[PDB]
Amino acid sequence: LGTENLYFQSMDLKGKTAIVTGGRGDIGRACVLELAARGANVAINYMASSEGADSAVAEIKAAGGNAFALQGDMTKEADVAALVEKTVKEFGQVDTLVHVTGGLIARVTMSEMTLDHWQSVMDVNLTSFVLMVRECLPHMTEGSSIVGLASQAGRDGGGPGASAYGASKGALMTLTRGLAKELGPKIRVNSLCPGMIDTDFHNRTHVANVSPVKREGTSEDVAKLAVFLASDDAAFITGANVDINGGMLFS
Amino acid sequence: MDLKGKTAIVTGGRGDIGRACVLELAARGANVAINYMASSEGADSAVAEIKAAGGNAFALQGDMTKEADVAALVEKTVKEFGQVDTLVHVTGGLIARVTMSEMTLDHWQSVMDVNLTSFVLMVRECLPHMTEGSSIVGLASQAGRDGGGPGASAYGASKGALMTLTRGLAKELGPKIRVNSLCPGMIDTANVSPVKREGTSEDVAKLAVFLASDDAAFITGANVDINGGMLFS
Amino acid sequence: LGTENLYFQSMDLKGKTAIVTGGRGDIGRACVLELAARGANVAINYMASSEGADSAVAEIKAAGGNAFALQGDMTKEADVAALVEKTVKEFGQVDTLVHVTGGLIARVTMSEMTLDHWQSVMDVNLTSFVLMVRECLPHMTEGSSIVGLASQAGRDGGGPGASAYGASKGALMTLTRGLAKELGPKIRVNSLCPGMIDTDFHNRTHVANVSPVKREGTSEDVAKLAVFLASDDAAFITGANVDINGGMLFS
Amino acid sequence: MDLKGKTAIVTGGRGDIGRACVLELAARGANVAINYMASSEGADSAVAEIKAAGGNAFALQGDMTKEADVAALVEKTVKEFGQVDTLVHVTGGLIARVTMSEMTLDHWQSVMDVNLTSFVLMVRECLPHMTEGSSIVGLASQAGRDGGGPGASAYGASKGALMTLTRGLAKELGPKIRVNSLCPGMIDTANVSPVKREGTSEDVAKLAVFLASDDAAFITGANVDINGGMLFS
Ligand SMILES: [Mg+2]
Ligand SMILES: [Mg+2]
């Protein structure tokens, strides 16, 4: 029973259901596994290859948990609706959203800016979050949470040719605050502001060296913070945009 | 008059804060090209006041979310006055209060376009014509820092994007061009605030023209709070 | 063995040693117990009554852990030296410092300010942290961490008559950043910025009501964040000042 | 000259940034009481320049960490000029680079006193004499926002305290008195920065006098970055 108490305490998300978008990428898959490790049911969106999503589902099921994956474009209203509908049909509720959909898309200077590029960056980073939050609200429970993935770029403008990306992440940071007020006390809303993370998805040695921690971050680093913020261990934290950048920027 | 010989574009010059910026710029000697969206009354009377005092200005109606109107304003500015020394972009607005639960894409996009896309379009259009030592001033909001008021989540998001973009462009466009924005609180366009009043368009214009001027040559990438002490950053 | 794996994973601070100052107060005692719950040895400073420190030590020992308590004034160089000396003599190392010493002392307006009051507030909140960090540095290991207790007051100036308190907490916030750079990569340094917390020590209904979470925070809320930041789960977070204020302020 | 008839105290007016603030204030018509710590050469020549242009100023040597010297400066200001309309506190400094591992209480306290306690003493001394619509300008630093440079942890801490105190006093002292501070980056008293140069004392003085003036009437509790785009807030 010393065990049973340990298991009970460790599995604090047992009985709860999470949606992770962008299980598509490294940070997303790490978040999926971190949520499941504490007992959450997980519905996994991915955009392109299903390889990492399928294997995450299989790992979760082998450990006695429950998950499924679904391809979709989170900039599309129909795909957003389908993901949430299938999540509720399968699990009956939604307790947390971790939205890892996003991206730089391309490096484009303002002098060469096109509306197509600007709109595409806004939609994948910001509109996708708007759509998912809207879709989830009818289903979220007392004590629910939303975790967004912003960036250090929201705080410093971003890197060369990334001005659209920075803008979209700054918008997400502000929206996190607006929604924390609009949706509390029922729902908490927080976002992460990662620095340089070593992933398939993002795009160097400089920055690792210049950083106080002398390394790039990992997807697992980010997942630990995401799940902390999603959990009841962060019950008095809402509207926060938490820097996870190895000491490269302070706020 | 340190802006003598210099050329300013003010968008949203109809137009409480915009109109105040127009007059402050002209008072320091700038030629001013004025955009307004709808009624011309305030823009036209500003032009008449400026001309009566020996200055130069014109007013042109246009929608700053439209590429053709953005191009027309900058083209006329360059033909009448020459190169652009400063852009003060006062186009923006909440449009309507709507909760996230009932958000539509149409509304979201509209708020993004009037507050943010319009700024992108104007900066892009101005860049080839901007002088050495020129500047851009954006109009953000306290809402960028605190998320905004009830039903204003889209508006807050658009202003937060503008704040970050200010930083991004300060790096991309320096040293040739400085980029700063203002973060106004409650403007009268109260006694909970330390200053115990609402701000005025003139308060905001004074900060805008300071940031536009050479007196702010070592300030770039700033988002300056002008909110009567209601919020600190 | 499914147990043993669970125990191994849950006790991530096993073999490590923490110093908590201000086990004296609610937040401090909660931090003590949260650290011990994950396996840390804990050395506990308290200023006045030993009641809560003694009972924490007894609870930890009953659960198979190790801790001791020691009265001391963390504004005094001799007491600071004695605490660290006794910690190292007992446990052989120091892996984390959680510094909960601090306080408003009294409400004093600037017009009525005295150097005595100003100095007293600076010393209990800021100088005490300087002394403890300095004392710990010869003993800290690869992968060590420091957690300070700042305040929402550092970000907004604080409440009526609390201008000295706010100043001391803003200093601590900045110092957190300076030390994250000076001491990394060996040591991470982060602080918490709590809003309204329901404790013996702090000093109301307004603020609870006005807050997005519609309540005051608890000592346990703060302890969860403190131990997250002290742990390897925050390995890519340094120089952060994390808001835990129920959504009353955003940064 | 909008500061005609108004009285300013500048501490640290010896004194690169301080001296520049003195001249900028006098150029807009202010009477200026000038503190300097040691050599009088820069303060005295500023007084002579101001007087030669028909203005009014005096210079008084004193240590702004000492209660008696703080009292003497404010007393003489009130006797010669009357009530205080603005305080620009430029007293401060790094003193020395020292790592935390080798920190002494003496050094820590010295840095706190010259940067922070001095400001506390001057504000307290000025309060009974400050006018309706008066202002305080502190000199913080980029170091308050990023922790400061190598061996400067004490200096950063003292400037971070000043930034927060600015907010606290903006609330406590409003609406009668506005309180703002400056957060300068590298001042020449570089090509990594967006503006590709170091700042000048004059850059800082222009911002200081803006914040001291009625042109900043709706700005209080601000800590304004003036760092050439090296840091954003
Ligand atoms: Mg020039
Ligand atoms: Mg007045």
JSON list of C-alpha atoms in Angstrom, two decimals, chain A residues 5-78:
[
{"chain": "A", "resi": 5, "resn": "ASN", "atom": "CA", "xyz": [-0.14, 5.65, -2.16]},
{"chain": "A", "resi": 6, "resn": "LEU", "atom": "CA", "xyz": [2.87, 6.45, -4.36]},
{"chain": "A", "resi": 7, "resn": "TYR", "atom": "CA", "xyz": [0.98, 5.49, -7.51]},
{"chain": "A", "resi": 8, "resn": "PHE", "atom": "CA", "xyz": [-2.04, 7.53, -6.40]},
{"chain": "A", "resi": 9, "resn": "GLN", "atom": "CA", "xyz": [0.14, 10.59, -5.77]},
{"chain": "A", "resi": 10, "resn": "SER", "atom": "CA", "xyz": [2.20, 10.23, -8.95]},
{"chain": "A", "resi": 11, "resn": "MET", "atom": "CA", "xyz": [-0.81, 9.85, -11.25]},
{"chain": "A", "resi": 12, "resn": "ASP", "atom": "CA", "xyz": [-2.44, 13.20, -10.52]},
{"chain": "A", "resi": 13, "resn": "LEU", "atom": "CA", "xyz": [-3.90, 13.48, -14.03]},
{"chain": "A", "resi": 14, "resn": "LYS", "atom": "CA", "xyz": [-5.69, 10.12, -13.82]},
{"chain": "A", "resi": 15, "resn": "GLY", "atom": "CA", "xyz": [-9.27, 10.48, -15.02]},
{"chain": "A", "resi": 16, "resn": "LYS", "atom": "CA", "xyz": [-8.38, 13.65, -16.97]},
{"chain": "A", "resi": 17, "resn": "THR", "atom": "CA", "xyz": [-8.19, 14.23, -20.72]},
{"chain": "A", "resi": 18, "resn": "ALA", "atom": "CA", "xyz": [-5.63, 16.32, -22.61]},
{"chain": "A", "resi": 19, "resn": "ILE", "atom": "CA", "xyz": [-5.47, 17.50, -26.18]},
{"chain": "A", "resi": 20, "resn": "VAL", "atom": "CA", "xyz": [-1.99, 18.13, -27.56]},
{"chain": "A", "resi": 21, "resn": "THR", "atom": "CA", "xyz": [-1.71, 19.81, -30.92]},
{"chain": "A", "resi": 22, "resn": "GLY", "atom": "CA", "xyz": [1.54, 19.50, -32.81]},
{"chain": "A", "resi": 23, "resn": "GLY", "atom": "CA", "xyz": [2.31, 16.03, -31.46]},
{"chain": "A", "resi": 24, "resn": "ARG", "atom": "CA", "xyz": [3.59, 16.47, -34.96]},
{"chain": "A", "resi": 25, "resn": "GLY", "atom": "CA", "xyz": [6.89, 17.84, -33.50]},
{"chain": "A", "resi": 26, "resn": "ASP", "atom": "CA", "xyz": [9.50, 17.14, -30.80]},
{"chain": "A", "resi": 27, "resn": "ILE", "atom": "CA", "xyz": [8.13, 19.38, -28.06]},
{"chain": "A", "resi": 28, "resn": "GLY", "atom": "CA", "xyz": [4.60, 18.15, -28.78]},
{"chain": "A", "resi": 29, "resn": "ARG", "atom": "CA", "xyz": [5.48, 14.46, -28.54]},
{"chain": "A", "resi": 30, "resn": "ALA", "atom": "CA", "xyz": [7.42, 15.08, -25.32]},
{"chain": "A", "resi": 31, "resn": "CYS", "atom": "CA", "xyz": [4.36, 16.85, -23.86]},
{"chain": "A", "resi": 32, "resn": "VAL", "atom": "CA", "xyz": [2.15, 13.93, -24.89]},
{"chain": "A", "resi": 33, "resn": "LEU", "atom": "CA", "xyz": [4.33, 11.47, -23.04]},
{"chain": "A", "resi": 34, "resn": "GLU", "atom": "CA", "xyz": [4.72, 13.68, -19.96]},
{"chain": "A", "resi": 35, "resn": "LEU", "atom": "CA", "xyz": [0.92, 14.07, -19.69]},
{"chain": "A", "resi": 36, "resn": "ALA", "atom": "CA", "xyz": [0.34, 10.33, -20.09]},
{"chain": "A", "resi": 37, "resn": "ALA", "atom": "CA", "xyz": [3.06, 9.58, -17.52]},
{"chain": "A", "resi": 38, "resn": "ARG", "atom": "CA", "xyz": [0.87, 11.26, -14.92]},
{"chain": "A", "resi": 39, "resn": "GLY", "atom": "CA", "xyz": [-2.25, 9.43, -16.02]},
{"chain": "A", "resi": 40, "resn": "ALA", "atom": "CA", "xyz": [-3.91, 11.68, -18.59]},
{"chain": "A", "resi": 41, "resn": "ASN", "atom": "CA", "xyz": [-5.84, 10.38, -21.57]},
{"chain": "A", "resi": 42, "resn": "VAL", "atom": "CA", "xyz": [-4.27, 12.10, -24.57]},
{"chain": "A", "resi": 43, "resn": "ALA", "atom": "CA", "xyz": [-5.73, 13.09, -27.94]},
{"chain": "A", "resi": 44, "resn": "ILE", "atom": "CA", "xyz": [-2.85, 13.87, -30.30]},
{"chain": "A", "resi": 45, "resn": "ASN", "atom": "CA", "xyz": [-2.98, 16.12, -33.33]},
{"chain": "A", "resi": 46, "resn": "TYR", "atom": "CA", "xyz": [-0.23, 15.95, -35.91]},
{"chain": "A", "resi": 47, "resn": "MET", "atom": "CA", "xyz": [0.13, 17.78, -39.26]},
{"chain": "A", "resi": 48, "resn": "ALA", "atom": "CA", "xyz": [2.35, 15.64, -41.49]},
{"chain": "A", "resi": 49, "resn": "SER", "atom": "CA", "xyz": [4.09, 12.36, -40.71]},
{"chain": "A", "resi": 50, "resn": "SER", "atom": "CA", "xyz": [2.28, 10.22, -38.14]},
{"chain": "A", "resi": 51, "resn": "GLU", "atom": "CA", "xyz": [5.40, 8.29, -37.15]},
{"chain": "A", "resi": 52, "resn": "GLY", "atom": "CA", "xyz": [6.03, 9.95, -33.79]},
{"chain": "A", "resi": 53, "resn": "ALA", "atom": "CA", "xyz": [2.34, 10.19, -32.95]},
{"chain": "A", "resi": 54, "resn": "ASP", "atom": "CA", "xyz": [1.68, 6.50, -33.71]},
{"chain": "A", "resi": 55, "resn": "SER", "atom": "CA", "xyz": [4.65, 5.41, -31.63]},
{"chain": "A", "resi": 56, "resn": "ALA", "atom": "CA", "xyz": [3.61, 7.66, -28.72]},
{"chain": "A", "resi": 57, "resn": "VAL", "atom": "CA", "xyz": [0.12, 6.12, -28.80]},
{"chain": "A", "resi": 58, "resn": "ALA", "atom": "CA", "xyz": [1.61, 2.63, -28.77]},
{"chain": "A", "resi": 59, "resn": "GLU", "atom": "CA", "xyz": [3.96, 3.45, -25.87]},
{"chain": "A", "resi": 60, "resn": "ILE", "atom": "CA", "xyz": [1.10, 4.92, -23.87]},
{"chain": "A", "resi": 61, "resn": "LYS", "atom": "CA", "xyz": [-1.14, 1.91, -24.49]},
{"chain": "A", "resi": 62, "resn": "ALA", "atom": "CA", "xyz": [1.66, -0.54, -23.59]},
{"chain": "A", "resi": 63, "resn": "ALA", "atom": "CA", "xyz": [2.02, 1.23, -20.22]},
{"chain": "A", "resi": 64, "resn": "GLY", "atom": "CA", "xyz": [-1.70, 0.84, -19.59]},
{"chain": "A", "resi": 65, "resn": "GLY", "atom": "CA", "xyz": [-2.82, 4.30, -20.65]},
{"chain": "A", "resi": 66, "resn": "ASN", "atom": "CA", "xyz": [-5.09, 5.63, -23.36]},
{"chain": "A", "resi": 67, "resn": "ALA", "atom": "CA", "xyz": [-4.41, 7.84, -26.34]},
{"chain": "A", "resi": 68, "resn": "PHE", "atom": "CA", "xyz": [-5.19, 8.31, -30.00]},
{"chain": "A", "resi": 69, "resn": "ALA", "atom": "CA", "xyz": [-3.81, 10.40, -32.84]},
{"chain": "A", "resi": 70, "resn": "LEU", "atom": "CA", "xyz": [-5.50, 12.29, -35.66]},
{"chain": "A", "resi": 71, "resn": "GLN", "atom": "CA", "xyz": [-4.02, 14.12, -38.64]},
{"chain": "A", "resi": 72, "resn": "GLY", "atom": "CA", "xyz": [-5.18, 17.69, -39.01]},
{"chain": "A", "resi": 73, "resn": "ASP", "atom": "CA", "xyz": [-4.40, 21.26, -40.00]},
{"chain": "A", "resi": 74, "resn": "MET", "atom": "CA", "xyz": [-5.02, 23.43, -36.94]},
{"chain": "A", "resi": 75, "resn": "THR", "atom": "CA", "xyz": [-5.46, 26.52, -39.12]},
{"chain": "A", "resi": 76, "resn": "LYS", "atom": "CA", "xyz": [-8.61, 24.96, -40.57]},
{"chain": "A", "resi": 77, "resn": "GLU", "atom": "CA", "xyz": [-11.93, 25.31, -38.74]},
{"chain": "A", "resi": 78, "resn": "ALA", "atom": "CA", "xyz": [-13.15, 21.88, -39.92]}
]
